[PDB]
Amino acid sequence: MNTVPFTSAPIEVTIGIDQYSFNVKENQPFHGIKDIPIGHVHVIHFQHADNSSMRYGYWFDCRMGNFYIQYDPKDGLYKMMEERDGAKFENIVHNFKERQMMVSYPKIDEDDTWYNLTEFVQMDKIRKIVRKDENQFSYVDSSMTTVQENELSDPAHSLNYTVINFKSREAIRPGHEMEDFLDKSYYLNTVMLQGIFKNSSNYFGELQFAFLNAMFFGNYGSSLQWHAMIELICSSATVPKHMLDKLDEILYYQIKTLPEQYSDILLNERVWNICLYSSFQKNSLHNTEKIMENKYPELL
């Protein structure tokens, strides 16, 4: 179990760690989060009490270094940093634990939610989508745009998701126009899975990361990417059976975890109705279709 200490909490802020969150008051004695499960990526995220504009945060994996949070009063945000002095870090943590100034990552033992939401998400792939190679952790916020969004403006601050465009030469083989547009299997299996992602695990990883950025930061381009990757699978007549079964589990837990009051903006009616009721895979997503129908029947 690992720890992310905080130097201090000088401004009132709502702090999230994965799917949990808690309020910290201005200058409240708060020195971090302990008992973070090892083996998963994690995200620590922030919404200031005075400017609910800009949710922002950091993706990290405690196996890759010792990370802490420190508020920067010049740039006005909580920043993640790496502590390279291992003994200095252990000492800092042990003292803050002894003073009981840390919140405990509050995982119920029965609960697999975070595993299920991050099953295929790896830090190494996150760091290719979010390029800042001098850090082991990755910053994301509400306003960052995707490479594809920029095509339709600061490249260093972009989300380099894999561009998916259904009316593009990459998606449509010359002479198979109708075939490839109505059945996207060649774009899914040959172009994307075999060519770009190499395997379904990396495809699901990016799909899951896109959802999480949409949910935790309200990142609109991430929501677009999540829905595009769903629609590319559902619009393919030929998908490996294991991918369909896994997709159903992935989306089930995403829909289960989505705040009910955010569905209106985070769920695209056209994609979901097409995927669950019109597409080739309309009958292959039983768990996802059942939770959607019981939780968001208005959308459909």
Binding site: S168, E177, F181
Partner: protein, 237 residues
């Protein structure tokens, strides 16, 4: 964006453009089977691709053999239309290729967009107008060449005959749309109007009769009357 009443003069400027109408591509007769079920029999169709500035009509005849062994023909017809329009564009010299293609039905947008990916600078546009191009098969010489075809065939026609020697494109298109609207609303009456006077003939190289300017005004007035009339007979006004 979309083509409508407000931007109607754009049709007659100097940027090359084509209308594409797919109404008459997939044509069937519906009939009973010996067992008392219903079946369709396809008949020859055509793509109606028209330059509204010059009157140049590229009439691609769609022979019933293209449907043999195919499923979901109404969907296929849109993609076949888009394939043939794309092939036509590729066949034209660069300086004759259109800058825009306006489809008369919105369902042609995605099929044509996908077939034209190689031409990113050609705009594919819908229209809000209710254009009467389905009535093209009420033009006897066009109907005749479609029905007689025994194989796929492209046939070239100027749909304005020689009118542009005496009138502008705007006026020519207005005349064309009035004639076709009349033919669509009441084909028999419309055709009676056009041929009532045996002394006015259709030149071998034309589609419509050789009316004088004064006779066109009379004709155009009779076609307007017809279209309001049928609008009374239909709505009881």
């Amino acid at each position: 964006g979309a083509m409508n009443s407000s931007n109607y003069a754009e049709l007659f400027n100097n940027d090359i453009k084509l209308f594409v109408d797919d109404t008459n591509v997939y044509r069937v007769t519906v009939h009973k089977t010996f067992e008392g079920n219903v079946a369709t029999k396809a008949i020859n169709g055509c793509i109606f691709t028209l330059n509204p500035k010059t009157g140049h009509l590229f009439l691609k005849i769609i022979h019933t053999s293209v449907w043999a062994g195919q499923k979901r023909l109404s969907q296929l017809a849109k993609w076949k239309t888009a394939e043939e329009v794309s092939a036509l564009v590729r066949s034209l010299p660069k300086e004759e290729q259109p800058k825009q293609i306006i489809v008369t039905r919105k369902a042609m947008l995605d099929p044509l967009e996908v077939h034209m990916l190689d031409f990113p600078n050609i705009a594919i546009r819908p229209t809000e107008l209710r254009l009467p191009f389905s009535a093209a098969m009420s033009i006897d010489k066009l109907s005749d060449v479609v029905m007689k075809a025994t194989e796929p065939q492209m046939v070239l026609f100027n749909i304005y005959d020689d009118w542009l020697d005496r009138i502008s494109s705007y006026t020519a298109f207005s005349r064309l749309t009035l004639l076709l609207r009349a033919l669509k609303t009441n084909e028999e009456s419309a055709k009676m109007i056009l041929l009532s006077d045996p002394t006015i003939t259709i030149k071998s190289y034309h589609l419509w009769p050789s009316f004088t300017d004064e006779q066109w005004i009379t004709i155009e007035s009779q076609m307007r009357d017809l279209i309001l009339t049928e609008y009374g007979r239909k709505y009881n006004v």
